[PDB]
Each structure stands twice: as structure tokens, then as C-alpha cells.
Amino acid sequence: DVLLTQTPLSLPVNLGDQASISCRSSQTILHSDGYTYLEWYLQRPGQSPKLLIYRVYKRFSGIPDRFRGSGSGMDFTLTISGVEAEDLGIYYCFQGSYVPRTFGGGTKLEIKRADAAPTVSIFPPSSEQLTSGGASVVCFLNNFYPKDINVKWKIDGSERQNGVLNSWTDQDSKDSTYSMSSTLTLTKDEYERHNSYTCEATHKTSTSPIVKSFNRNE
């Protein structure tokens, strides 16, 4: 089978900049009929993939001329000249010269912005929940950049690792930040055997964590 490898995996750009992504194949995409069936697709969040370029460089109807495909053989490039907000999403290359058809693993085109520390909020389990015999402690880490972030839970100062569910948003369309939710799940009985619960957020914007805590005896 033919392997298509795409680089980079993620590409943060400023709006209006030029973006360039690479698709390399394990075998030539030149078909015996003399054509090269190398295509590029864009998939926006919550949408199906949409065809941008076919036959290496030909733009599909309605595709703006800032999209330019190039390459031959085993090496291909998609260049976007003046990225606009509607261009953000995941780009896939695809070859139609062999069976099976195969796709690259996608390049996610995103917005570069200045670094920003998270705004951290901690919530004890609601009184409503404790009646269910479960106890979820929630920590929102909101509106930070870049996307990489650590959260450490501690219970009375002691690091806690199981029971944790961490989930990130996609890049915000208004300010291009990310947010993440971390939940520590305990039984009601576990939760009531300890005093304080702490969320520590570590992010490249500081060598010290942002620490949010509450004491269940308050």
C-alpha cells in the first residue's frame, strides 16, 4: 500500500501569513495514464472534508486562488498565500492512483497568538452530587496559549493521579486561546476523608504553577 506522510502535524500561523505543508508518498503518484492523482482536502471543525485541489495543482470550482498545490512524483506541497479565518481546520492529502486509496494523517492549521497564562477556577462537588455517593472536583483552566498545559491534583498536599479526566477545547474563534477542564472523581466517602483539594496548573508562561485550592472544612 502507499503511505502518505504529512508534516508538520500542527501549523500555527498569523492571519494573512503564508502557510506551507508537505505531503510525501512512499511510491510515485504518477499514474500510467500520465496524470498524477494527488488531492488536498480541508476539514473544518464539525464539517465533512471538502475538496480543494485535485491533479496536484488544479483548483476545484469556487476555491480561491490563494490555494496553490505543487509537486510531483513523491513530494507535494500545499501553499496558502494569505491565510484567512475560513481556512482554519485540518488539511489532508489523498492519492487516487492506487488501490487502496490512502490519505495523509492531516495537518491542523491554527492561529498563532501571544502567550497567555490560564485563568483557573476550582469547584467543590455540588451538594446535589454528594447524595449520589459520588464526588467530582472540577478545575477550569481557561483562555490560555499555547495549548500544552499540565494539571496536578493534590489532596491534603499529596499528589493524586487516577480518577482524573482532562479535556481540551479547540482553539477559540474569538481570541485564539485554548481552555481545558480537569475533573477529579472520588467516592463520596473518599472525598469526605480529606481536608483540602488543590488544582495546580503548570504552563510555559511561568516556571511556577497557578494554584487553586479549597478546604472542605469551610
Partner: peptide, 19 residues
Amino acid sequence: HTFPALLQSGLYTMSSSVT
């Protein structure tokens, strides 16, 4: 902020914040 769901004990959990 709408946080994508994850599985726990064979069921989904998600959260949502508003500021």
C-alpha cells in the same frame, strides 16, 4: 467553553463553562 466528552465507567462525562 464546551469541553469534549470522555468515557468513565462506560458512560460519557463532559462539562461546560460560562464566564
